[PDB]
Amino acid sequence: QGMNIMPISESQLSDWLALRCLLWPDHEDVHLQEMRQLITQAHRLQLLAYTDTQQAIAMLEASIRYEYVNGTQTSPVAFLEGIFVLPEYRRSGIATGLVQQVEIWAKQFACTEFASDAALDNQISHAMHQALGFHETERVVYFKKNIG
């Protein structure tokens, strides 16, 4: 009679896409191509939260990382790839419940650290991360060049 978290199945790709496009606006086929791979992967977790009326109101994606993640001292570590809750549902703390499901899952992979990141100019994401129990570790500038 409230909210409910579940790992995403192929049957729920549309509900996943609808929220995923709000988080990361992009071409539908790019999303779907990625979504279909992720659900076959053991090192990936993707969840949806539903209401009574079967409305998908939140999603989370996470991974297990074996390469060095900034701010960490162990490997592997869990990593938050994306989380999105509809505004009307933020005060419900379903985001806390989603995060907690990753930790149970990450514990299976012998992880003791759960990392994430956010754009430097997105302070709201910084406030959200702290509200979920994350603390800041490092601020980083990324560079790259083409290899000719």
| Contact partners, residue 57, CB within 8 Å, separation at least 6 | 3, 49, 50, 51, 85, 86, 88, 89, 94
Which residue type sits at 147? Answer: I
Say if residues 44 and 38 touch (Cβ distance below 8 Å). Answer: yes
83 is in an annotated binding site: yes
Binding mask 84-123 for a copy of itself (x = CB under 8 A): -------------------x--xx---xxxxxxxxxxx--
**85: partner contacted, choices Cl ion, a copy of itself, none (Cβ within 5-8 A by kind):** Cl ion
**Torsion sign over Cα 135, 3, 18, 89:** negative
Of the residues 45, 80, 85, 98, which one makes contact with Cl ion according to CB under 5 A: 85
Q: How far is the CB of 105 from a copy of itself (least distance, A)?
A: 10
**72 in contact with a copy of itself (CB under 8 A):** yes
**37 in contact with a copy of itself (CB under 8 A):** no
